[PDB]
Design a binder for this molecule. Structure first.
Ligand SMILES: O=C(O)C[C@H](NC(=O)CP(=O)(O)O)C(=O)O
Ligand SMILES: O=C(O)C[C@H](NC(=O)CP(=O)(O)O)C(=O)O
Ligand SMILES: O=C(O)C[C@H](NC(=O)CP(=O)(O)O)C(=O)O
Ligand SMILES: [Zn+2]
Ligand SMILES: [Zn+2]
Lengths: 153, 310, 153, 310, 310
């Protein structure tokens, strides 16, 4: 259901729709939660101005269905975006990335003497509302870090 | 069963005052009447991937002092991990199949954590994991603080030395922050300063804490002076200006000392404390050392015995 | 003289339009070209269909035009890929990537003992077609490797 | 007295199915009801001239799990042999005068043999002598094979990895070759191939064995898959092409796997097995590890107790 | 001007027959009519980042033979590149501002080429860059082959030894491929055979080469038996299987060899040439080492001098 100006069949029978992604954030996400490592018909719109959002990135996958967890994780890079559970072409549910408990596998502890590097285990940070940002606490080393300084796999 | 039964003692962040209080109680109990057979038939593994005199030895005596048998190692250099490229996890995987509990010290952080992921039912006791925790240390500390002060609330506590890398002070600050009205004075090199994440905890808890540039002025209003050696081995070459102790304490400094005040030190000490102090009575680090038996015992006792110790 | 067959198109007013991109090479391109930086709206057709080409990736970049060398190293990545220049909503230009003579600054000489690693210089291989694959000779070590191996850097 | 009483367990070539069978039996027995005091008053020496995690630790627990006391060493570097130029024989000469039994691991072959020449009455247990034997290993192996298969005759046994230098597979091939209708498939680098002298034994015995170039085709007709790490430390520089594992096993490979088939590994493993396998049920090497107690126990029990264990 | 004046001699692949012939002809002239002062007032740099006995010295003698002055280092260890951490690019960049040409030997491949990009109009001459090119070698070699055979076409040349890492034969083969009807036999262990891209030129030029598992298959065939040393320094651990000579030349294997045939060797030799060969009238390695003087002057002359007239 996309509105006016020209054509765009960026709308499917089945799939998920990451509306309102802050510009540039689009690309990242695609890699981070590796959303391209599927085979379903993906369609990605980068920097497409809309109105409400001067320029908003945006992604949609065909036949693919986001997990309440998988979803939440986006609350670190685009908490103000909207997921749309598109079934039979019509919106069945409109969700939003809400901050999660902790972010298992896809985040590398910046601590070099962390055991999480040497040994084969899945990364893991607890998430927290520090002040003007999120704080990240390695499951192992117990060192916590800004969600701006921590890097991810 | 008792609260700490079959529980992993990994970080002090996962214990409650009740927990702390329980070990203590049990320490004071066992110190009065020992239970030489309390843990016979049990076999505990003493795994030290890192150096230790106090921690390892005091723990092993504890196990023997309770009829338990001990196996393990002081150096990983001879372990298959040591010479065959084994992984710590697989290491723990096999070891969990042999013994009833695992005491381990390790050069990296969250190493004990890691181990509980493979340890299975077998509880894991952290004897120090990098700059991170040192819970069993804290327990003897508290036991000693209480021994000599009569309480763990409303103390004036000064932590001098390396706090950035001091797992010792990491845990223990967390521990009395679980108590009320505790004044924390921090005297540290600006690079070996105390980590943010410990201060925040203090902030939110509303516990008060204030940096200080010398022992000189904290010295009159302190019950406890916790001294620490500079964790020289964990130092970064850009911190090697700080390898020498900034704050040395001699007997002279203690005139103003409250008569009740004691000097504490995790040990070992290199020059941050001068032997003259050893004579004076505020000096308690060697008594502090002696207390590690009781705490380690109490702990062992609790973790291995369902029914609250007689 | 207008839009395509299958039902998901958004023809740009001016800009390049890469089509026929072999599967899961559409995202490589997007990165190994830094076309995600720009502001211009971008359209990405991932895992698109083909029937005869199977799944295809297509890149619609609005108002941006491919460097005349950038298409020369794309000659390697997606040889079956086509690039449609577009002006006033139309396919004004039509080009296809032929294998350049030598390519520099992007590939890495697989020879470890190559000076190029240690020293501060820009790579450079000569692109000569064998029978079944392109062979690349590093300009310094003078070793020749097949484009498959030099495509691991 | 029992057959293995006061006997040296040096090589599997010197044991009989009856012998094997006896230890097993006794293992399964002690595993059901332990005898915590069976060996009290005894002192056993744990002499490791070589690295070990599993072998040394599992043995020492065994001794403690039977009331025995333990003395010994994990590294010869601190022995007078280590620093005073003593001879292994004289070493064994003095040690035989102190303890009731000697467990030793050593970097060279026939080292345990040697020791029995000076050990005196005191029985010698080989915990591994170079590329040669590893009998106690074999025992837990068999115990495990039988645990999971119900028998030791008529098995399809695939030995992958380093077999030229694998004392582990040296012994164990000899061991099931004492059993009937055992199919041996050998997957090894042409240089880490299995030694002639083990094959001949197989020839004369009429036991069947066939080289294979991949796990892929043996995989459907095997009860046991014995994986081994490349004995990197015993490798010759002209064999360092083979230091990396040729045959890695992942979960994917096990679709065709008989539902009863188990993966075994002496441990440790470096990359010859991928952690995904760890999830799957053919994986038994960590259970395999756990069994070393029982076998080592049974053995200890038999060698030290005249009267067949209750 | 001459075709070589001011040129970089980096790779044989960058020169033509006529370029070669030019040098051998000058080589020829100088060997009989010496030019004591040809390069007088010229100052040349001898920069060896790697060991050399023959190449460095012969070069430097050539220089002095021509009256040029020399300046350089036998080793990078006490350069600011070696201790202060200078890039080679910066290194060639300042040295190029001092001297009249640059002779360079370097352990990495392509070092030669990169210098030219920094030496400005100052010619750079490859005394060897890793196992890539040894152009100056090929010149004294050509010269030496010519001198003994009287031609450079329709020769039967054997190339034994490390061919994969042999920079001397990489360079020698492209050079003879510029001539007519040469026949190449390559005898080397599989781990070290003639690199593909080399053969690719051979084939693609319509030249006839052939591989042989031994020396004695071609012994009465070949005109030149070019022996090479195993480049153990450039060897990979996986290739360490092959560090010993696989084809060794004895003075008895020469029994059926052509009488005009000469044994060459870039040198040094370890054991792949028996000292008894040295006496045989086939042994020619030491004489060719001598011709390095002539080819090398020859070279120096052509690059630094617009018009030579002898
Ligand atoms: O390192 C120190 O100074 C404090 C502390 N030391 C102790 O535990 C005493 P020891 O190392 O003998 O067990 C530790 O964190 O290792
Ligand atoms: O070396 C091995 O891989 C197999 C075998 N390993 C074992 O016995 C286990 P560990 O060395 O911990 O005692 C041995 O022969 O040492
Ligand atoms: O090293 C060899 O065996 C052949 C050859 N050797 C020579 O150049 C002789 P030298 O090392 O004395 O200069 C080389 O390429 O360095
Ligand atoms: Zn961490
Ligand atoms: Zn190169």
């Amino acid at each position: 259901m996309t509105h006016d100006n020209k054509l765009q069949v960026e709308a499917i029978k089945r799939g998920t729709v990451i509306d309102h992604i802050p510009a540039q954030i689009g690309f990242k996400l695609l890699s981070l939660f590796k959303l391209t490592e599927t085979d379903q018909r993906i369609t990605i719109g980068l920097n497409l101005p809309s109105g409400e959002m001067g320029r908003k990135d945006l992604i949609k996958i065909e036949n693919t269905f986001l997990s309440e967890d998988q979803v939440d994780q986006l609350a670190l890079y685009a908490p103000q975006a909207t997921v749309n559970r598109i079934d039979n072409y019509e919106v069945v549910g409109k969700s939003r990335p809400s901050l999660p408990e902790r972010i298992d596998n896809v985040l590398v502890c910046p601590n070099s003497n962390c055991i999480s590097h040497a040994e084969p285990v899945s990364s893991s940070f607890a998430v927290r509302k520090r002040a003007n940002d999120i704080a990240l606490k390695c499951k192992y080393c117990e060192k916590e870090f800004s969600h701006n300084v921590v890097l991810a796999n | 069963a008792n609260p700490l039964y079959q529980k992993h003692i990994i970080s002090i962040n996962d214990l409650s005052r009740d927990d702390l209080n329980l070990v203590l109680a049990t320490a004071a109990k066992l110190k009065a009447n020992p239970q030489p057979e309390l843990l016979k038939h049990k076999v505990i593994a003493s795994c030290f991937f890192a150096a230790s005199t106090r921690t390892r030895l005091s723990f092993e005596t504890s196990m023997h002092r309770l009829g338990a048998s001990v196996v393990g190692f002081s150096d990983s250099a001879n372990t298959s991990l040591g010479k065959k490229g084994e992984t710590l996890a697989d290491t723990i995987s096999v070891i969990s199949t042999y013994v009833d509990a695992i005491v381990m010290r390790h050069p990296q952080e969250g190493a004990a954590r890691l181990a509980t992921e493979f340890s299975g039912n077998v509880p894991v006791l952290n004897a120090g994991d990098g700059s991170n925790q040192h819970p069993t240390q804290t327990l003897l500390d508290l036991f000693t603080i209480q021994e000599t002060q009569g309480r763990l609330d409303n103390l004036h506590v000064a932590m001098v030395g390396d706090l950035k890398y001091g797992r010792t002070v990491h845990s223990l600050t967390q521990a009395l922050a679980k108590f009320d009205g505790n004044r924390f004075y921090f005297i540290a090199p600006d690079a070996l300063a105390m980590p943010q994440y410990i201060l925040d905890m203090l902030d939110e808890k509303g516990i008060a804490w204030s940096l200080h540039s010398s022992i000189e002025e904290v010295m009159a209003e302190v019950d406890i002076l916790y001294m620490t050696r500079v964790q020289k081995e964990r130092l970064d070459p850009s911190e090697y200006a700080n390898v020498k102790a900034q704050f040395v304490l001699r007997a002279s400094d203690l005139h103003n000392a409250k008569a009740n005040m004691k000097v504490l030190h995790p040990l070992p000490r290199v020059d941050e404390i001068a032997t003259d102090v050893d004579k004076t009575p505020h000096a308690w680090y060697f008594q502090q050392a002696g207390n590690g038996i009781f705490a380690r015992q109490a702990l062992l006792a609790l973790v291995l015995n369902r029914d609250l110790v007689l």
